[PDB]
């Protein structure tokens, strides 16, 4: 029950799509605008991550949770790659190489939660989903690079690598297969 559900869904925020489109703070480009406060949905998924993955049950309390559960899965996919990185510099570029990969968009088959996400009905949502979900990934990767690699030796830090074995309710963004 008391898993950390998404905090940011102030009704004044635009709510495009089957998920909270949210103002991803980044120097990348996309449909979502720029948040100015110090807290943001990618920072929220990062912040709550270590707790969230232990909770074996999780409701959708509001539309922003169907965002947060996807950000969490991609964060796990970051660790599934950065753990191999030989140094932080590789940990950045070999993360960008992940962000621009053709992840199954929730309405596409092979996405793990097709029961929970409605299909995007038209190009002006589908193409928005392609341009939003990349903007999530492109940013989400660059934030983990700064804090998975502890600064003494550009080792991928052990404490983070512990979580490599753990998956949010045992769902995988590899889908039925990569």
């Amino acid at each position: 029950m008391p898993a950390y559900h998404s905090s940011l869904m102030d009704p004044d925020t635009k709510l495009i799509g089957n998920m909270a489109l949210l103002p991803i703070r980044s120097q990348f480009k996309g449909p979502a605008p720029r948040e100015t406060k110090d807290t943001d949905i990618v920072d929220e998924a990062i912040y709550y991550f270590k707790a969230n993955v232990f909770f074996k049950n999780y409701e959708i309390k509001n539309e922003a949770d169907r965002t947060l559960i996807y950000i969490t899965l991609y964060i796990s996919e970051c660790l599934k790659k950065l753990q191999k990185c030989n140094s932080k510099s590789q940990g950045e570029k070999e993360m960008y190489t992940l962000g621009i990969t053709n992840f199954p968009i929730p309405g596409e088959p092979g996405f793990p939660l097709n029961a929970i996400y409605a299909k995007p009905a038209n190009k002006q949502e589908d193409e928005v989903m392609r341009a939003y979900l990349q903007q999530l990934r492109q940013e989400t990767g660059l934030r983990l690079c700064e804090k998975v690699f502890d600064p003494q030796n550009d080792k991928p830090s052990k404490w983070w690598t512990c979580f490599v074995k753990r998956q949010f309710m045992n769902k995988s963004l590899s889908g039925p297969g990569q």
Partner: protein, 414 residues
Amino acid sequence: AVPRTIGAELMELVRRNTGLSHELCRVAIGIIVGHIQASVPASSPVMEQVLLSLVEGKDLSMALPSGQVCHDQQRLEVIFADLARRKDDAQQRSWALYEDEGVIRCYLEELLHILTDADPEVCKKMCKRNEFESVLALVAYYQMEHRASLRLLLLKCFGAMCSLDAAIISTLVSSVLPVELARDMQTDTQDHQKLCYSALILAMVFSMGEAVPYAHYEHLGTPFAQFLLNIVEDGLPLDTTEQLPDLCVNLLLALNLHLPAADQNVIMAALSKHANVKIFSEKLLLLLNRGDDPVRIFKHEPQPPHSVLKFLQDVFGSPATAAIFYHTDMMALIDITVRHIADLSPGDKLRMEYLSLMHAIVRTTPYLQHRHRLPDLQAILRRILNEEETSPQCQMDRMIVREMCKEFLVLGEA
């Protein structure tokens, strides 16, 4: 006319009744259905269709042979369950109660057979079935079980499973199995029989040289390498068969294969960090003159670089690492290299590799001092440079030779 059904059900039904291994089953079918028509001209056009319906293979004739699953998979879908249920039998596995070992053995003995008597197309699909959960169960269970009597059977299973598909290798390398083997081998050195397989399996999974999680260097790093350098030089006082020196050479070559460049290499640190490099330093020569390498026993699709040459290229990456040769062993290295440099057929991949080796030897250690074989070096490089052969590799050869001579003009005789 013959329904396609015989093209599979006959092969399935014989296996379930006889226990014949799959390929021996396919012969056992062919020999009956062949010989009878060879003895019975009048109705042969019936049997000749039976033959073709099995010559085409499982690609469609075994597609739902009767809307049913082949007996081998009927067992695997059981055995993988009854293991994965004892994993996370959280009570029993830490606070034991029942006589579990005598039944677990029966599953693993059966699994070890079916992992080789079945059609590999079945067992491949049962491994990759659900993001490799079948594999991660047994890998977790190997870490979980401290009984030495069972571990041998789990290692033998990993042996077969490694053979089925390189994708399974790409799982195991990235997984915990190497690190437990690294600790078991350093600690349980008394278990010589298991220790032999322990080395062998670790050598198999590393054979593809994929990148490895950086956490693994906490064990498979330099200390474990020095631990290997002991065994190949000294053997063991308990070593009745004395096999482990050879398997440790294979393992050293295998671990080396993925290592980047020659700066950070955990093995090349170990080699530089002891003077205990005699029998190992010589034994590498007997591989080099053999020309093959023992790695890549499976020959999966992206066949890895020739491991012996890669190793020496790293060995000659540093002068501290190049010193590990006695001068007489060093001369043998040069002679063996020029032999291949003379004998290889143009344009094969290996020709660049042996060429690169000699280039490193000339750069990384004194050579222009004593100039052994150096007039022959001039002869070979001149014949390479002047050769009429043109191809991507032979063009690449022509580039390296010119640049190598530019660095060391005496190699061209100016």
